Amino acid sequence: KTYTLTDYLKNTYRLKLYSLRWISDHEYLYKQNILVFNAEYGNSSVFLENSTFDEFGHSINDYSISPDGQFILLEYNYVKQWRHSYTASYDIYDLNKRQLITEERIPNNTQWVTWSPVGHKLAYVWNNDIYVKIEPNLPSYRITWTGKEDIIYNGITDWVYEEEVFSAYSALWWSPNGTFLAYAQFNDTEVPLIEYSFYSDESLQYPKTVRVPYPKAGAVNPTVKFFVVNTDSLSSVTNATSIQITAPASMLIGDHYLCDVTWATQERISLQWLRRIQNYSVMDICDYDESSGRWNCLVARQHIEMSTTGWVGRFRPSEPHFTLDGNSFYKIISNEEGYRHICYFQIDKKDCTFITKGTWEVIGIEALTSDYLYYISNEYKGMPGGRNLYKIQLSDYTKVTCLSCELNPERCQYYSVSFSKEAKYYQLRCSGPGLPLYTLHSSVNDKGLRVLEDNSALDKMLQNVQMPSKKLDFIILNETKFWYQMILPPHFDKSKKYPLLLDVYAGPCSQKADTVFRLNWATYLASTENIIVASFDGRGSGYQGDKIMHAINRRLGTFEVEDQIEAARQFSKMGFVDNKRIAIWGWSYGGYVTSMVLGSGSGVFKCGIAVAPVSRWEYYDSVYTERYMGLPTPEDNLDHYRNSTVMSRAENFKQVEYLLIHGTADDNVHFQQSAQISKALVDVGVDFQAMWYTDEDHGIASSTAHQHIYTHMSHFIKQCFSLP
Ligand SMILES: *[C@@H]1O[C@H](CO)[C@@H](O[C@@H]2O[C@H](CO)[C@@H](O)[C@H](O)[C@H]2NC(C)=O)[C@H](O)[C@H]1NC(C)=O
Ligand SMILES: *[C@@H]1O[C@H](CO)[C@@H](O[C@@H]2O[C@H](CO)[C@@H](O)[C@H](O)[C@H]2NC(C)=O)[C@H](O)[C@H]1NC(C)=O
Ligand SMILES: Cn1c(=O)c2c(-c3ccccc3Br)c(CN)c(N)nc2n(C)c1=O
Ligand SMILES: *[C@@H]1O[C@H](CO)[C@@H](O)[C@H](O)[C@H]1NC(C)=O
Ligand SMILES: *[C@@H]1O[C@H](CO)[C@@H](O)[C@H](O)[C@H]1NC(C)=O
Ligand SMILES: *[C@@H]1O[C@H](CO)[C@@H](O)[C@H](O)[C@H]1NC(C)=O
Ligand SMILES: *[C@@H]1O[C@H](CO)[C@@H](O)[C@H](O)[C@H]1NC(C)=O
Numbered sequence: 001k002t003y004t005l006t007d008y009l010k011n012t013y014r015l016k017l018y019s020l021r022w023i024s025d026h027e028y029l030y031k032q033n034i035l036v037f038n039a040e041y042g043n044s045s046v047f048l049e050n051s052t053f054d055e056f057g058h059s060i061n062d063y064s065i066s067p068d069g070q071f072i073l074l075e076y077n078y079v080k081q082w083r084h085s086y087t088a089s090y091d092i093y094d095l096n097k098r099q100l101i102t103e104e105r106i107p108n109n110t111q112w113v114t115w116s117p118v119g120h121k122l123a124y125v126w127n128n129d130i131y132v133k134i135e136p137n138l139p140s141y142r143i144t145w146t147g148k149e150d151i152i153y154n155g156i157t158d159w160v161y162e163e164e165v166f167s168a169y170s171a172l173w174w175s176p177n178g179t180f181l182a183y184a185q186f187n188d189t190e191v192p193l194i195e196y197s198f199y200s201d202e203s204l205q206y207p208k209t210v211r212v213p214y215p216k217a218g219a220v221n222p223t224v225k226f227f228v229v230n231t232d233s234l235s236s237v238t239n240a241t242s243i244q245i246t247a248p249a250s251m252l253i254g255d256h257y258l259c260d261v262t263w264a265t266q267e268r269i270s271l272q273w274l275r276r277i278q279n280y281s282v283m284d285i286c287d288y289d290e291s292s293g294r295w296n297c298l299v300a301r302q303h304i305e306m307s308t309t310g311w312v313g314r315f316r317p318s319e320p321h322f323t324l325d326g327n328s329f330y331k332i333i334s335n336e337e338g339y340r341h342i343c344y345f346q347i348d349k350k351d352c353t354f355i356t357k358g359t360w361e362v363i364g365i366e367a368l369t370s371d372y373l374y375y376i377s378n379e380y381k382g383m384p385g386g387r388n389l390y391k392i393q394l395s396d397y398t399k400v401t402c403l404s405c406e407l408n409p410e411r412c413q414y415y416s417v418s419f420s421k422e423a424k425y426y427q428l429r430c431s432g433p434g435l436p437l438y439t440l441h442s443s444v445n446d447k448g449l450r451v452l453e454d455n456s457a458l459d460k461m462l463q464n465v466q467m468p469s470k471k472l473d474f475i476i477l478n479e480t481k482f483w484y485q486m487i488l489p490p491h492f493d494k495s496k497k498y499p500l501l502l503d504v505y506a507g508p509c510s511q512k513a514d515t516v517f518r519l520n521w522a523t524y525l526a527s528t529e530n531i532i533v534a535s536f537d538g539r540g541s542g543y544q545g546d547k548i549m550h551a552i553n554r555r556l557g558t559f560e561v562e563d564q565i566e567a568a569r570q571f572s573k574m575g576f577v578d579n580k581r582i583a584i585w586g587w588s589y590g591g592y593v594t595s596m597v598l599g600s601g602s603g604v605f606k607c608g609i610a611v612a613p614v615s616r617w618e619y620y621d622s623v624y625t626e627r628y629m630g631l632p633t634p635e636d637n638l639d640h641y642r643n644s645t646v647m648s649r650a651e652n653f654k655q656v657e658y659l660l661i662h663g664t665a666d667d668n669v670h671f672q673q674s675a676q677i678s679k680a681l682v683d684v685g686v687d688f689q690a691m692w693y694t695d696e697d698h699g700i701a702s703s704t705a706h707q708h709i710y711t712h713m714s715h716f717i718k719q720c721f722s723l724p
Pocket of ligand 6: 177179266
């Protein structure tokens with residue numbers, strides 16, 4: 001048998017995880033029941049029994065233990081908002097007493113909750129205001145009084161910061177020992193609202209108009225203010241005093257962003273700011289003052305990160321990782337030859353020394369200790385799509401060990417890692433090319449303690465089913481290596497011609513050609529429908545240097561789009577591809593590229609599918625768009641904004657078969673965008689196929705809708721490829 005569409009839609013073959021929460025330097029949790037394992041022995045005693053909350057009345061969505069392990073916080077009444085943001089009711093359970101707290105509880109509809117990094121201090125955000133509980137039973141101190149729905153955000157992010165800047169809803173940051181609580185405040189007063197209909201249940205007679213403060217390219221952005229409050233000196237008589245840390249002079253000159261908040265030590269905080277034109281960023285190191293009780297950021301402590309050839313950082317400037325004393329830090333910056341590597345900065349010095357070098361990039365700094373710095377890079381065998389954990393010696397930078405390279409070179413080439421509190425032990429997470437392999441290691445002698453999850457249960461199931469393989473190779477364009485990957489059908493024959501579907505994302509810093517193992521839509525197409533599904537990382541793709549990544553700076557919808565067309569052209573010359581049946585599909589940014597590729601009138605692609613695509617950049621949000629495009633004004637980059645629209649390629653769709661799909665409640669890429677494509681195709685007399693998904697957002701992640709879309713796409717693809 002083969003991996004069917006039903007197999008994918010109904011999760012027939014499930015990949016087992018081993019998700020763990022580190023609690024101390026040698027202990028971690030796991031849900032079977034809630035067990036607490038040991039890194040030393042492996043013995044696990046139950047921390048909270050499966051049905052300790054049998055008589056609770058509510059379905060517990062998530063749990064949160066305080067760092068001292070005295071209290072557990074229970075999350076229920078989950079009402080998802082955007083990608084990360086949501087609402088939930090909260091209850092605190094005493095572990096040393098075994099009972100819920102009934103007096104002065106966390107109110108219904110709480111936006112965010114967080115324990116202090118040590119002890120059991122609690123900070124929550126309700127109605128856009130910040131509250132603090134020193135004890136779980138005592139009443140909370142209201143920190144901010146400015147919070148206003150859709151307008152003022154305290155300790156929580158507005159739409160744009162959540163999606164594009166912080167990849168999180170929370171804008172609260174406890175100091176390492178929970179003394180201070182650092183928070184941002186967003187102001188959307190003048191940010192225009194995106195409005196769309198929400199039809200809701202059949203029972204709703206008149207559709208709801210959802211109105212979200214959302215800054216489209218070049219529109220009035222939110223403004224950010226930072227504050228730090230002293231939770232140890234809070235009063236229940238007078239209002240909490242919140243010390244402001246104003247952005248540097250070089251940022252207040254115009255529009256800016258708060259892009260990073262990292263605590264250095266107990267009395268030292270680092271803030272990274274970014275100009276609206278995102279090629280200049282500055283880090284303020286701010287120390288706490290004694291008798292004045294304020295925060296000072298010495299101008300000589302300012303470290304600038306900029307780019308002449310593009311934008312600063314990959315999506316944002318990388319975070320700093322401070323040494324224990326906080327007088328030095330390590331962060332990832334692009335070097336002189338364009339490659340991103342770890343630089344060792346001195347708090348007082350302007351220059352930094354690169355501790356890593358080469359034609360490959362560092363993905364992230366994982367752990368910093370007294371002796372070693374741990375990082376993940378794609379250095380192994382020069383494969384940008386690989387991931388390996390590396391140890392580097394601080395006293396000598398030439399002393400670099402690979403902790404995951406030679407563990408299992410065959411099945412493991414894509415690693416992520418989870419270090420314990422003081423990095424004494426780490427959990428390695430293998431994601432491909434073989435089945436996912438979760439292992440636990442001791443960082444002292446680097447020995448392998450035990451296999452946590454090998455996915456043998458899945459392995460035996462898949463031995464029976466005809467599975468597709470992955471080819472991960474590179475082509476040479478203009479004397480430069482460009483990596484592609486192919487999900488090859490089972491019993492792959494080189495002499496037989498195959499239909500090829502080109503899976504596309506192609507966004508700036510994208511990587512679609514990697515060593516990860518995945519069971520997805522492509523797996524079915526290769527397995528059951530015998531379709532080669534291929535992905536290609538061209539100009540604009542990440543993890544290969546700024547030379548390749550910035551190639552599409554201020555020029556979105558050009559070089560990355562030509563490169564998908566060129567990839568498909570290169571694949572035709574490979575011999576095993578049917579050039580009469582080549583298709584292309586993408587989601588989000590991929591949808592835009594798909595559209596653009598089909599609108600190019602190249603002739604390569606017979607048909608395509610764009611899902612929730614960007615139609616033109618003035619419709620997408622400011623932060624992401626202007627990072628690559630700049631402002632849509634005559635004196636900046638308006639010419640290319642106008643030239644890079646899919647609507648202006650409408651005429652060309654007469655040569656191709658198009659399926660446009662979009663959700664009606666898409667907060668991310670508004671249905672507007674597809675509405676303008678459809679209208680454009682309609683005006684030039686192009687027959688195409690469409691599909692809206694009522695009340696579905698950008699993920700189109702409803703169980704029934706997910707199933708529907710993929711089934712609908714499968715028909716389109718099969719119909720296009722002459723498959724019954
Ligand atoms: C957030 O910004 C808004 C708009 O920029 C501020 O609203 C202004 O407030 C001042 C004084 O309070 C008034 O004189 C202006 O007329 C207001 N402008 C508009 C159009 O509303 C608002 O005060 C800021 N919010 C806070 C308090 O942080
Ligand atoms: C702490 O600050 C809040 C907000 O400024 C105060 O509450 C306001 O009180 C003033 C007059 O005392 C009223 O004009 C506002 O309508 C109140 N806003 C609300 C409902 O929060 C509060 O009194 C302050 N606490 C003290 C006494 O220091
Ligand atoms: C496919 N894809 C993205 O499109 C994407 C996008 C993106 C780009 C343009 C339009 C909509 C989105 Br969402 C963004 C920007 N919000 C992002 N941060 N990541 C993306 N990824 C990982 C991603 O995989
Ligand atoms: C493992 O056994 C030791 C016995 O000394 C004990 O300290 C530890 O709590 C046990 N681990 C768990 C949490 O089951
Ligand atoms: C939340 O509201 C419900 C009724 O809508 C109520 O029963 C519950 O006690 C509330 N939660 C608290 C403790 O505020
Ligand atoms: C937390 O750190 C602060 C600031 O350095 C210090 O005043 C205090 O001693 C620490 N608190 C505790 C309880 O360790
Ligand atoms: C930022 O980009 C603009 C054009 O987009 C350019 O004129 C300017 O020089 C850049 N700034 C820096 C610091 O390189």
